């Protein structure tokens, strides 16, 4: 009668990051974007689709730049959360009870 | 046949009937610089 159970209660810190990027619009670009809000028989379709094509291309580049950078951030914190093998392995090996 | 040869994979063959009248031609490419999205608002 010397056996009793024990429970462990560790808690984790949530931490906090973000991601930011820049995205530029020209004066001619935004001025044409204003007329496409009221797209009608006026505002020519070929130039309108050229504008939305170029701006959607640039918007998708800046959108998946975040998607690219997420891997960099996670690999960086993985390097920040690692001890060497040549340090840990003799510690894990040559220690019977402590 | 040039196509069934293994060297054919290094070329993209395409037809062009009006080539004998070509004086001159250009083609363009618009590959952009890929960027990373680092966290800080810089």
């Amino acid at each position: 009668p010397v056996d009793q159970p024990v429970h462990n209660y560790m808690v984790k810190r949530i931490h906090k990051r973000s991601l930011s990027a820049a995205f530029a619009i020209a004066s001619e670009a935004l001025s044409l974007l204003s007329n496409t809000y009221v797209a009608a028989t006026e505002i020519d379709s070929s130039l309108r689709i050229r504008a939305i094509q170029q701006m959607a291309r640039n918007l998708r580049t800046v959108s998946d730049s975040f998607e690219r950078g997420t891997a960099d951030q996670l690999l960086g914190v993985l390097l920040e959360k690692a001890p060497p093998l040549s340090l840990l392995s003799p510690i894990n090996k040559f220690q019977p009870e402590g | 046949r040039f196509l069934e040869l293994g060297l054919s994979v290094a070329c993209i063959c395409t037809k062009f009937p009006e080539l004998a009248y070509v004086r001159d031609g250009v083609i363009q490419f618009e590959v952009q610089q890929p960027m990373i999205a680092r966290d800080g608002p810089h």
């Binding site: 701006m55 959607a56 291309r57 | -």
Partner: peptide
């Protein structure tokens, strides 16, 4: 502006040849 198109999905740009006459 409205998009009015698919959100890209691996844009394959067009090769244009310009012949001079």
């Amino acid at each position: 502006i409205p998009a009015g198109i698919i959100p890209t999905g691996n844009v394959l740009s067009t090769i244009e040849v310009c012949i001079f006459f």
